[PDB]
Amino acid sequence: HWGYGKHNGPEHWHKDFPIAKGERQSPVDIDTHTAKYDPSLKPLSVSYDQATSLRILNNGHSFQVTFDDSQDKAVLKGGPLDGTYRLLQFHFHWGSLDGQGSEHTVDKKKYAAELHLVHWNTKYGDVGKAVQQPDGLAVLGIFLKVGSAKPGLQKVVDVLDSIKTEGKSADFTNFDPRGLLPESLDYWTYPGSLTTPPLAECVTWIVLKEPISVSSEQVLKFRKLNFNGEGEPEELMVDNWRPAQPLKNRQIKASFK
C-alpha cells in the first residue's frame, strides 16, 4: 500500500490517512531566525546507560533497532517534556544522493539523512495508547551530514547486508545508542506528528542543532537496502523521507541563543 514512490508516496497518503492534511503535521522547515529562544526550556536529559537493544529489522520503509521498553532503562526526560519517555526504537530516513534525505530542514537546507529516536510517555503505559494522545511520544531527531565516519554507527551498518529486503530481522543486542549522539544537546522543539502512517498528531519533536558526521561508505550501505521483499523486483530503499509540511499555527522554540 503506502510508500515513497510516484503512485503511493507522501502526496497520496491523505487518502488513507486524512490527518495528513492536519494542523500539526511533521516534518517542517525550521526557520532559524523565526524560532524563539525560550530561556524557560530545560536541558534535555538523555539516560541511555541501561539501554537493552533487541533486534534490527527491515520494515519495508526503513530499518529500525528495537529496544526493551518494559522498564525505565533508556529514557528521555526534561527539555520541553513533562514526565518520562521510554526509548522504543530508532530508525533513519535518507536520500539517493547526499543533498536530500532529511525530513526536517533548517533554513530550507536538507541533510543527507535524519535519525529518529522514538520514545513514548510512560503515563500511557504502552505505545499504542500513547499514539492516541497529544503528548504521547517524543522523537529526538538528529541530522546526518557526510564527512568523517561515526564510529558508533559502524555496528549498525555492518549488519545491514543481513536484512536487505522487507521482512528480514536479526539479533542486535548490546548496542549503545549513546554512540549516535552529537556533542551538544542544544535543540529546537515544536508539537507535531509521526512522519509515516498513521501520521498521528502525538509527538513532541526535539531536533538537535548539531548534526553528526557519517562517512560516504556508511551512507552507501543504507542505500543498498531494498524496499521490496525477497523475490520481488529490486527497488533500492532510498528517498524514504516525507517533505516539509505547513507550519500552520505553531511556534518552534529554541533551547539556545
Ligand X SMILES: Cc1ccccc1-c1ccc(S(N)(=O)=O)cc1
> Which x/- pattern over 74-113 shows residues binding ligand X (rule: CB under 6 A)?
----------------------------------------
In the set 1, 7, 33, 61, the catalytic residue is 61
Q: CB-wise, 105 or 196, nearer to ligand X?
A: 196
Q: Does 221 bind ligand X (CB under 6 A)?
A: no
Q: Is residue 104 marked as binding?
A: no
Residue type, 203: V
CB of 127 to ligand X, least distance (A): 6
> Any catalytic annotation for residue 61?
yes
DSSP assigned state of 180: G
Listed residue (58, 254, 84, 78) closest to 166, CA to CA: 58
Number of residues that bind Zn ion (CB under 5 A): 1
Any alpha helices (H) in 52-159, and if so which ranges?
A: 127-130, 154-157
Q: Does 242 bind Zn ion (CB under 5 A)?
A: no
SS3 (DSSP) at 49: coil
Q: Does 127 bind ligand X (CB under 6 A)?
A: yes
Binding partner of 219, given ligand X, Zn ion, none, CB within 5-8 angstroms per partner class: none
Q: Does 19 bind ligand X (CB under 6 A)?
A: no
Residue from 86, 110, 116, 209 binding Zn ion (CB under 5 A): 116
Q: Does 30 bind ligand X (CB under 6 A)?
A: no
Report 136-155 residues binding ligand X (CB under 6 A): 139
List all residues 6 or more positions away from 44 whose beta carbon is below 8 Å from its beta carbon.
Answer: 76, 78, 79, 140, 185, 187, 206, 255
**DSSP letter string over 54-123?**
EEEEE-SS-EEEEE--SSSSSEEEETT--S-EEEEEEEEEE-SSTT---SSEETTBPPSEEEEEEEEEGG
Q: Does 131 bind ligand X (CB under 6 A)?
A: yes
SS3 percent helix, strand, coil of the chain, rounded to 5, is 15, 30, 55
Kindly list the residues in this chain that would bind ligand X in the complex (CB under 6 A): 116, 118, 127, 131, 139, 194-196
The catalytic residue positions are 61
Kindly list the residues in this chain that would bind Zn ion in the complex (CB under 5 A): 116
